[PDB]
Amino acid sequence: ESSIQVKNKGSIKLSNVKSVVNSSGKLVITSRNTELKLIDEFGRTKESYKVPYGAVLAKGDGEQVAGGETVANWDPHTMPVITEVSGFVRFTDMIDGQTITRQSSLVVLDSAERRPALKIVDAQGNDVAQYFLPGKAIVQLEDGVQISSGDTLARIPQDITGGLPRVADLFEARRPKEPAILAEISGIVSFGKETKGKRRLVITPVDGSDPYEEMIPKWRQLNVFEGERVERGDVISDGPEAPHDILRLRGVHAV
């Protein structure tokens, strides 16, 4: 996230990096899938160096550089996230003993104890931009802060053994320890069904066009966003992937 070493001259080659208003004099990223490339003198690339959305650029797009320099530094542990709207943070549904556990800096709300995402107060008395609240959140700035766009307020910061067994597992297509959960039907991040017959966070679909039912275990954690996180297709949400999923979704050539 913070360590990016380059060799020689090149361009940025964002390859569809979502540029959003960053806190610094830069464009923040809201796209999970960011792939870079280096154009020294021809179309040949020198590295890919995929970076998360939390990265904030230090160089412009396509700018030639001498080399040996980072282009965008991101928190190795903290996961900075761009705010949906610019203005005061709208906090509601706060209950003592259920939404406040530790202490100012305090937890927003607990899903099990009770995700307030009403709106964001862009002005003093005008709001828009839903602030989804995952578990174990932290809020350090109260309402009326009137912060600028691009600020992050604790947006949840932070087998493959090479050899013959790996070759066999590849050939027999052994299922991974943590297959990535995919839903190619209206993939916009939502909330609900935290406690049902399935595990935590059972389902997370969106309307889109003809929504489908996708059970989600949410064993370790999630990879949800505010909105327009994913589009028609699927991306690796959590853990390694499985050949069957790629065959049934991405096609044959990708596999």
Tell the residue number behind the tokens 């309307």, with chain if given.
207
Tell the residue number behind the tokens 């991040």, with chain if given.
189
The three-state secondary structure class of 20 is strand
Neighbouring C-alpha atoms within 13 Å toward the C-beta of 17: 29
Q: How far is CA 154 from the centre of its chain?
A: 13
Helix residue ranges per DSSP H, the chain:
164-171, 243-249
Q: How was this structure determined?
A: cryo-EM
Of 111, 82, 105, nearest to 24 by C-alpha is 82
- Distance (Å, rounded) from C-alpha 170 to C-alpha 197? 33
The three-state secondary structure class of 106 is strand
Read off the amino acid at residue 164: L
Helix residue ranges per DSSP H, 71-163:
none
User: What residues pair up with 139 in beta bridges, in sequence order?
Assistant: 106
The three-state secondary structure class of 167 is helix
Phi, psi (deg, nearest 5) at residue 244? -65, -40
- Distance (Å, rounded) from C-alpha 74 to C-alpha 95? 34
User: What residues pair up with 56 in beta bridges, in sequence order?
Assistant: 28, 73
- Distance (Å, rounded) from C-alpha 201 to C-alpha 234? 18
Contact 124, 132 (CB under 8 A): no
Of 180, 190, 179, 178, nearest to 229 by C-alpha is 190
Read off the amino acid at residue 9: K
